[PDB]
Amino acid sequence: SELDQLRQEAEQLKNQIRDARKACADATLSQITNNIDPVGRIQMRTRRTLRGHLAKIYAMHWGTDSRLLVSASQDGKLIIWDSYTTNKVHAIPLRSSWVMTCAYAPSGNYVACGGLDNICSIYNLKTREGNVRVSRELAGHTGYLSCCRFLDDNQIVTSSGDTTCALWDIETGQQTTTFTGHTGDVMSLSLAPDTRLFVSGACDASAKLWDVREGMCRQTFTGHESDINAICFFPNGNAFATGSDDATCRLFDLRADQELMTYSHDNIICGITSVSFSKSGRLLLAGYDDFNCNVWDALKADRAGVLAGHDNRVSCLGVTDDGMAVATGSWDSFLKIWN
Amino acid sequence: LIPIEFVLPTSTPETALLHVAGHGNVEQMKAQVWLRALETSVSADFYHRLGPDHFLLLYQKKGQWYEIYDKYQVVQTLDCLRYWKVLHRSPGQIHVVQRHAPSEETLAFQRQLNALIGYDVTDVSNVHDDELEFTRRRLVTPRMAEVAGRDPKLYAMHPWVTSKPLPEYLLKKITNNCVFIVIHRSTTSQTIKVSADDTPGTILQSFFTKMAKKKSLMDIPESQNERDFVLRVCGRDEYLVGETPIKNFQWVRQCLKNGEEIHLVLDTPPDPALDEVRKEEWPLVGYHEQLTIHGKDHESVFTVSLWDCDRKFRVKIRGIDIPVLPLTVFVEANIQYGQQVLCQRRTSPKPFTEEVLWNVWLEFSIKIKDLPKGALLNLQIYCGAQLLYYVNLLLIDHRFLLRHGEYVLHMWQLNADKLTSATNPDKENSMSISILLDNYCHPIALPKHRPTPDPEGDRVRAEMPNQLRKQLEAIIATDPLNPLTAEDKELLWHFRYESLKDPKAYPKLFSSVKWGQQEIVAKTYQLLAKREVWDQSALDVGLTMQLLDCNFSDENVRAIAVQKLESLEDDDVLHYLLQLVQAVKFEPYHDSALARFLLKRGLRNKRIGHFLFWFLRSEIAQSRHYQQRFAVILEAYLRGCGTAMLHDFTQQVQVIDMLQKVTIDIKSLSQVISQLKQKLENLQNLNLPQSFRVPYDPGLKAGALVIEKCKVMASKKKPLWLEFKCADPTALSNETIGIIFKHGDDLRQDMLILQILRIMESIWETESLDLCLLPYGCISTGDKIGMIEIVKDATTIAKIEVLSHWLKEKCPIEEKFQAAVERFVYSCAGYCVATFVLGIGDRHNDNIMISETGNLFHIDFGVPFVLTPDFLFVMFQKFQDVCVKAYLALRHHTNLLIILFSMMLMTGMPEDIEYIRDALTEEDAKKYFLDQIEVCR
Amino acid sequence: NNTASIAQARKLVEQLKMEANIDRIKVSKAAADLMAYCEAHAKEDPLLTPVPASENPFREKKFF
Ligand SMILES: Nc1ncnc2c1ncn2[C@@H]1O[C@H](COP(=O)(O)OP(=O)(O)O)[C@@H](O)[C@H]1O
Known part of the structure; x- marks a missing residue:
């Protein structure tokens, strides 16, 4: 009675959402974008190689200076690199070897990391003694720390294996907000340029837009046939792309609350590990589990180029805030800069 | 306090009401009663003469006379009080009865048993604890229960039933679902044909009904009913009764496979009592909250939980002392857990005198609160580096308490040995070590973990990301000889419920857990409290073997492994008995669940009892390091079986010894033959009995020795080629039970290797092939002394293209001839494929023997293999097809082959484990295997 | 186990109500906007x- 009536109300509101989305689906991005000049072939060259990690690299994140970058690795170390000079600005050994994520703070003073340990260890690079000292152990998550991004020097969002995300205030060591609702492990997230919104991708083959201010899911996007491994915002902040283990990427617009474009090719069979937009967003750089990192024209949906510079899975990648270079860390223990 | 009514022995037996402190100690209570008695006694003289030791406190629990053995048990914990309170008994009654010294019957019985075992069970001259005697007292109850529930008739007859379904090549042998049975009665023969799927009882009822009227002609008394007969193989004592398909008996299937006829003879039901069991009179022998100081007043403190002590473990050495002078020396202690090194501590080099003193305290980084149940202080005396001695000591004793005081231990001198927990018996020329463990005003107990729900796994139930799942499963897919790197250990430990439902990972899961911590162990116990998938899993016997292996010492992991073994049927138990034995070596304690498993299987089968008896006797005589443990189990066993088994063991042991003496004496140097025959006639004069079930055959009795058929060979050891004669007049033929008795060559190898091959074929037969191998039974009896069976009509291949001429000639007909040709091929390829896996295929022809009937067997287990040209000439398509189907069939149980090859290579023989894999190597493996076959060609 | 199933289905339906109560925009304009952003x-x-x-820090120069 109460549960069957509430289940049929759920399953009516769902088709009301599908119809509210189909209504706006008047034309595709492929139709409107047929005319624009194709991007051509993005011939990219390996500018740098970052040696020093002994095993798989699990994460990396550029600093806002577009020159420094953190990197987490299976060998249990958290290294800070100077991309321009290749020198290791810091080689921090970690308490847990199973680090999975890292995030250079936009301020550059703090860096955060975490992993299977179920703790988000926040480190201060500018320490009282100039050492690499641990500022905080943000504990409370009941699962492995899967990803995190600094809002400021005192606030940081982290996702975990409890199927939830959470905003923390570094000083209080307390979960400011808790983002519940997902039905699967949350693999990734992405802060909007406006720190009030962020999206998150999960293994149930759906993504969800959260309001940092309040902590509610604003929209939920589907379409992937498998887990979402990576997610990021379109530079403007009104759209975002998702990579999935279904060997396809997809674009979703928040205002249209539906998929705009699909990026895939029959040759590609392995899942997507990472994605990033160019400063303008015209280029989508997708990392794959075939040692490749394909460059797509986001508007034409055409595979503009291919980056094949790694010997193992291209696990992670990022783009500088100035779009000057692309970093790609991989299981080969080496990151590679591209231009 | 509580009121208890104690019954004195003084006349009616005086009884008085007393009170005992609710939190007292057994002994005190004794004194309490002693004084009141001494004061109220009508004749206190009797109590004055004696003391409290002479009497024992017995209480009847529902008619069962229980004794309060341990003298330090908590008075409240006494089950008697709980039983009374549930019964509302007030005041409770306990009786006081003197210690009546033994009688003679019992001492003679004990002497008999000790003669059987080869070691005294009451020897206490090489012991530092009372562990052995308490094990002996404890084992009584399971044995009494196991004996209480069983059938006399079935056990005495011990049907060798089976429950596997027939292989292909044997189903055809049954035409129209029927088989031909020869029936003997007197010398009257009656051939009948009965369906292969009819149980023997129905067969006997039918045999009665068919010929009931002419029963006199068959020479059966007419007064007997159907109840008076059962079938019995002619020439054996292997009865055929019960409710089992007549196709499910290993002898029927052997007769079919080899192809002989089925001969059976009617027999009478052996009586139940003859297996009577010697009566026995040995009477019927917490949580962290209660065992911790915190939360309690110092006035009422009685014990300290081991987990409250944060002090780093510390041990004081005093010195070493060798009476005999054999440089720098130095002790090097190390805590170890199942070959895992927890912590170490060495000491400075010192001058090497016959006695060297240190009087130094070593401290271990591990904390007294972080000791697992069954760590093992290993103490070594290196030399300069070459190790010279070693010794080990349990840090928690057998009753959940820590070790405290001064201990002097004797040193074994240099495996399952280096993990030995016994003191050297040689107290005259052995290096001695003296150490001190600091005392404590109260016992250092160790509570029992309590099961608590673990939400870390309960609500963590959504499928993990496909990448992490891929990594997990890819890790689990390697062989157990793949060492788990720290990374993998951490990954698996976090994912400690993704693997809970995958049995094929359980000996990689528990190879990550870090026992040196308390939280880890508590969470492991929580994990193992939820084991639904494991419980109702597939009863594999390569997995439950890596659970009973060396690397593990827990009390619950082995518990679940044995709970899986609880289901096996008889034949399998018997298949892997040898290895179960080599496995009890690795135990941490004497009283375990593996030992009780072996004991409980031994008491409901006779073949199991026989094989267990001989294996344990061999190991006792051969392996002193654990001989006390083996002996305790073996004696706890021998008191359960029947009198007939005792008599049979006695006669068997008599014959083995007598021959021992004769043999060695001979090996001292027609002269030898004549002296041997004189000594054998003396043996007949020494009453060498003619009724002893041959050790490797519970049904095959030997008889009076045929003196002229014996001899001494010209080989190295020159064993005796005895030829006994059957001892049952209903033998279908007049063939001689042949044996060979060799001394000076290790006979542990041939035993294990034969179990290996015997399983290799049990796998092949599980795969509906038949390679026709000949596992002749061998059993070892002492150090470099072992009886071997004889393969009738055998010859040496080195002694003999001419091979096929020899064969042809031997075979008078081309039909039998080609039957032999199939045998020679099937069996020459089988043996090849099966020696190549083990890495011992390289052998000179001196160790290969061909049987006239077509079979080919190897001997003397001390190029891929031997595939000499003669083998090819005697043979080619079928050879290859069989070779491939074999190798492919074997590689489907590599986990088990490698487990065995290892669980043995350590306990037995003196990188070595790698070969098995280089050669184990689907299509690519076939190509390699055939490159190995065609290259030897 | 209805109070849990019901509290969950209620969270679900309040979420779907949240998501459905947004004024979406025609896809054509979403594209035009993104295209003109890249432009x-x-x-x-x-x-x-x-x-x-010369403007690329990686290629032209080693000193920074
Ligand atoms: N089951 C058996 N049946 C017949 N003969 C056997 C059996 N087992 C061993 N032999 C004989 O024993 C001899 C080998 O004895 P052994 O002492 O092992 O030789 P070596 O000392 O050269 O290794 C062979 O000649 C073989 O005929």
């Missing part, structure tokens, strides 16, 4: 349009 920042996106080697 605007195509000059300011060196990954899209190759920049001079």
Whole structure:
């Protein structure tokens, strides 16, 4: 009675959402974008190689200076690199070897990391003694720390294996907000340029837009046939792309609350590990589990180029805030800069 | 306090009401009663003469006379009080009865048993604890229960039933679902044909009904009913009764496979009592909250939980002392857990005198609160580096308490040995070590973990990301000889419920857990409290073997492994008995669940009892390091079986010894033959009995020795080629039970290797092939002394293209001839494929023997293999097809082959484990295997 | 186990009500907006349009 009536109300509101989305689906991005000049072939060259990690690299994140970058690795170390000079600005050994994520703070003073340990260890690079000292152990998550991004020097969002995300205030060591609702492990997230919104991708083959201010899911996007491994915002902040283990990427617009474009090719069979937009967003750089990192024209949906510079899975990648270079860390223990 | 009514022995037996402190100690209570008695006694003289030791406190629990053995048990914990309170008994009654010294019957019985075992069970001259005697007292109850529930008739007859379904090549042998049975009665023969799927009882009822009227002609008394007969193989004592398909008996299937006829003879039901069991009179022998100081007043403190002590473990050495002078020396202690090194501590080099003193305290980084149940202080005396001695000591004793005081231990001198927990018996020329463990005003107990729900796994139930799942499963897919790197250990430990439902990972899961911590162990116990998938899993016997292996010492992991073994049927138990034995070596304690498993299987089968008896006797005589443990189990066993088994063991042991003496004496140097025959006639004069079930055959009795058929060979050891004669007049033929008795060559190898091959074929037969191998039974009896069976009509291949001429000639007909040709091929390829896996295929022809009937067997287990040209000439398509189907069939149980090859290579023989894999190597493996076959060609 | 199933289905339906109560925008305008965004920042996106080697810090110079 109460549960069957509430289940049929759920399953009516769902088709009301599908119809509210189909209504706006008047034309595709492929139709409107047929005319624009194709991007051509993005011939990219390996500018740098970052040696020093002994095993798989699990994460990396550029600093806002577009020159420094953190990197987490299976060998249990958290290294800070100077991309321009290749020198290791810091080689921090970690308490847990199973680090999975890292995030250079936009301020550059703090860096955060975490992993299977179920703790988000926040480190201060500018320490009282100039050492690499641990500022905080943000504990409370009941699962492995899967990803995190600094809002400021005192606030940081982290996702975990409890199927939830959470905003923390570094000083209080307390979960400011808790983002519940997902039905699967949350693999990734992405802060909007406006720190009030962020999206998150999960293994149930759906993504969800959260309001940092309040902590509610604003929209939920589907379409992937498998887990979402990576997610990021379109530079403007009104759209975002998702990579999935279904060997396809997809674009979703928040205002249209539906998929705009699909990026895939029959040759590609392995899942997507990472994605990033160019400063303008015209280029989508997708990392794959075939040692490749394909460059797509986001508007034409055409595979503009291919980056094949790694010997193992291209696990992670990022783009500088100035779009000057692309970093790609991989299981080969080496990151590679591209231009 | 509580009121208890104690019954004195003084006349009616005086009884008085007393009170005992609710939190007292057994002994005190004794004194309490002693004084009141001494004061109220009508004749206190009797109590004055004696003391409290002479009497024992017995209480009847529902008619069962229980004794309060341990003298330090908590008075409240006494089950008697709980039983009374549930019964509302007030005041409770306990009786006081003197210690009546033994009688003679019992001492003679004990002497008999000790003669059987080869070691005294009451020897206490090489012991530092009372562990052995308490094990002996404890084992009584399971044995009494196991004996209480069983059938006399079935056990005495011990049907060798089976429950596997027939292989292909044997189903055809049954035409129209029927088989031909020869029936003997007197010398009257009656051939009948009965369906292969009819149980023997129905067969006997039918045999009665068919010929009931002419029963006199068959020479059966007419007064007997159907109840008076059962079938019995002619020439054996292997009865055929019960409710089992007549196709499910290993002898029927052997007769079919080899192809002989089925001969059976009617027999009478052996009586139940003859297996009577010697009566026995040995009477019927917490949580962290209660065992911790915190939360309690110092006035009422009685014990300290081991987990409250944060002090780093510390041990004081005093010195070493060798009476005999054999440089720098130095002790090097190390805590170890199942070959895992927890912590170490060495000491400075010192001058090497016959006695060297240190009087130094070593401290271990591990904390007294972080000791697992069954760590093992290993103490070594290196030399300069070459190790010279070693010794080990349990840090928690057998009753959940820590070790405290001064201990002097004797040193074994240099495996399952280096993990030995016994003191050297040689107290005259052995290096001695003296150490001190600091005392404590109260016992250092160790509570029992309590099961608590673990939400870390309960609500963590959504499928993990496909990448992490891929990594997990890819890790689990390697062989157990793949060492788990720290990374993998951490990954698996976090994912400690993704693997809970995958049995094929359980000996990689528990190879990550870090026992040196308390939280880890508590969470492991929580994990193992939820084991639904494991419980109702597939009863594999390569997995439950890596659970009973060396690397593990827990009390619950082995518990679940044995709970899986609880289901096996008889034949399998018997298949892997040898290895179960080599496995009890690795135990941490004497009283375990593996030992009780072996004991409980031994008491409901006779073949199991026989094989267990001989294996344990061999190991006792051969392996002193654990001989006390083996002996305790073996004696706890021998008191359960029947009198007939005792008599049979006695006669068997008599014959083995007598021959021992004769043999060695001979090996001292027609002269030898004549002296041997004189000594054998003396043996007949020494009453060498003619009724002893041959050790490797519970049904095959030997008889009076045929003196002229014996001899001494010209080989190295020159064993005796005895030829006994059957001892049952209903033998279908007049063939001689042949044996060979060799001394000076290790006979542990041939035993294990034969179990290996015997399983290799049990796998092949599980795969509906038949390679026709000949596992002749061998059993070892002492150090470099072992009886071997004889393969009738055998010859040496080195002694003999001419091979096929020899064969042809031997075979008078081309039909039998080609039957032999199939045998020679099937069996020459089988043996090849099966020696190549083990890495011992390289052998000179001196160790290969061909049987006239077509079979080919190897001997003397001390190029891929031997595939000499003669083998090819005697043979080619079928050879290859069989070779491939074999190798492919074997590689489907590599986990088990490698487990065995290892669980043995350590306990037995003196990188070595790698070969098995280089050669184990689907299509690519076939190509390699055939490159190995065609290259030897 | 209805109070849990009901509290969950209620969270579900309040979420779907949240998501459905948004004024979506025609896809055509979403595209036009994104296209004109790239058109605007195509000059300011060196990954899209190759920049001079001198302006690239990685190639031209080793000192920074
Ligand atoms: N089951 C058996 N049946 C017949 N003969 C056997 C059996 N087992 C061993 N032999 C004989 O024993 C001899 C080998 O004895 P052994 O002492 O092992 O030789 P070596 O000392 O050269 O290794 C062979 O000649 C073989 O005929």
